[PDB]
Amino acid sequence: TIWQVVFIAFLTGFLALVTIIGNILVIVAFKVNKQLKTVNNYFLLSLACADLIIGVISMNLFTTYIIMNRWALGNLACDLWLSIDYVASNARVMNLLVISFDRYFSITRPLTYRAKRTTKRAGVMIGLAWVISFVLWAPAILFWQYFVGKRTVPPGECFIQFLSEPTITFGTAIAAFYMPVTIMTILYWRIYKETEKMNIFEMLRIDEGGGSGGDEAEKLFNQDVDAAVRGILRNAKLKPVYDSLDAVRRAALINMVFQMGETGVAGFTNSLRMLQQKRWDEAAVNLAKSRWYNQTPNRAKRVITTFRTGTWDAYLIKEKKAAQTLSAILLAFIITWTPYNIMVLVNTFCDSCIPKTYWNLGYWLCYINSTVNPVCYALCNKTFRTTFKTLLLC
Ligand SMILES: C[N+]1(C)[C@@H]2C[C@@H](OC(=O)Nc3ccc(F)cc3-c3cccs3)C[C@H]1[C@@H]1O[C@@H]12
Ligand SMILES: OC[C@H]1O[C@H](O[C@H]2[C@H](O)[C@@H](O)[C@@H](O)O[C@@H]2CO)[C@H](O)[C@@H](O)[C@@H]1O
């Protein structure tokens, strides 16, 4: 009826508009901001590309197929839609796998990947994913009707030919969706556990803004930090404070003796006392007024924060921020696409058990995943929230 056509036509355009607006802003945010240009940001820019294609082409075309209750766009337009639709969405699963192995390899491979991240190398990865995804689906969808000779697709209907068999589709959804989902789940929970770990060596690494130097180099770092402890114990002016501190706040003390020496730190007589009196906020205010805070306010602010809170917050906030962002991107991907794939599994053991409508809903729901990503960006990352605001108004 007229009600069903206008109702459908509204929310598809409403969702299509949100998608196009959001993904078009994030792409501008990367070009309009010199502070958003990171390796991680480059990847997310790739998703917006595939996501923007979905919001522009796939939503309007497929929305016409379901509205008119039949496909009338022509035969060659059908092979382009399905191919582009499947090549783009497949690149999305590729980008997510790369984003996962980026953080994972960034958190597990400080030797090579941590120090091998180049915005030029990134382009190679995105290049692989897009070219690979194109090859897997474009030729198969376009030319399959030629290898078999005839076309199984009735006129006025548009669907992938070689996917007509349900058993063949089940194996395809396994490799295309389930397996990538399984891997990304494995990498996440490992990255998640990594976000809670921190010691004095990584504390000094971060403060120094440096990196590893192999085995021989890492053994020397251990000697120097070990000797730093002895100096504190041999020093009669520091050992009292050190012995009355917790494992975290002790690392903060070693962080100072490492930067200024035993005698230099022993000069903080008042501050070294308030620490032994566990008057954290009072000692923090005192250390803030020293020259040491004016000569290295970044390193001091973190070490001082450690004394106040007694936690690794100043040395882990960056890692957690990314972890939360990745959790959102994954969760959106899992929530929206799972229905459709669960139908593929069900339909494999059922001659006909899914109505034509349930399939069309899962198909459009998968599209919605391309609508939520820009929202997740602005919700978690603060830089996107401000950059998006200055684009609409300013
Ligand atoms: C546009 N989509 C709505 C996207 C999401 C849905 O695909 C899925 O969830 N998995 C699949 C199930 C069977 C199959 F043979 C291939 C797929 C996939 C193709 C690319 C990534 S998985 C259905 C279509 C498809 O292009 C994707
Ligand atoms: O700047 C030299 C440094 O000597 C001590 O600190 C570290 C030093 O940075 C390491 O290279 C290695 O030598 O171990 C030393 C500590 O045992 C002082 O503690 C430090 O103040 C001084 O700057």
Author numbering: 63 to 259, 1001 to 1118, 482 to 560
Excerpt from the paper describing this PDB structure:
An example are drugs targeting the muscarinic acetylcholine receptor (MR) family, which comprises five subtypes. Thus, the antagonist atropine is delivered directly to the eye, while the chronic obstructive pulmonary disease (COPD) drug tiotropium, which reduces bronchoconstriction via the M3 muscarinic acetylcholine receptor (M3R), is delivered by inhalation. The development of selective antagonists for muscarinic acetylcholine receptors is challenging due to high homology in orthosteric binding sites among subtypes. Starting from a single amino acid difference in the orthosteric pockets in M2 muscarinic acetylcholine receptor (M2R) and M3R, we developed an M3R-selective antagonist using molecular docking and structure-based design.
The single differentiating interaction is that in M2R, the B ring interacts with Phe181ECL2, while in M3R, the residue at the same position is Leu225ECL2. Third, the docking suggested that a small electronegative substituent would be tolerated at the para position of the B ring, further increasing repulsive interactions with the Phe181ECL2 of M2R, while still fitting well with the Leu225ECL2 of M3R. Chemical modifications, including the synthesis of quinuclidine- and scopine-based quaternary ammonium salts and the bioisosteric exchange of the terminal benzene by a thiophene ring, led ultimately to the antagonist 6o (BS46), with M3R Ki values in the low picomolar range. An M3R-mT4L fusion protein was expressed and purified in the presence of 6o (BS46), and crystals were grown in lipid cubic phase. We obtained a 3.1 Å dataset from 93 crystals and solved the structure by molecular replacement. The electron density for 6o (BS46) was unambiguous in a Fo-Fc–simulated annealing omit map. Compound 6o (BS46) binds to M3R in the predicted orientation, making all interactions predicted in the model, with the fluorine oriented toward Leu225ECL; overall, the crystallographic result superimposes on the docking prediction with an rmsd of 0.377 Å. When superimposed on the M3R/6o (BS46) complex, the fluorine would sterically clash with Phe181ECL2 of M2R. The selectivity over M2R is enabled by an L225→Phe substitution in the orthosteric site, while in the other three muscarinic subtypes, M1R, M4R, and M5R, Leu225 is conserved, and so the compounds show no selectivity against these receptors.
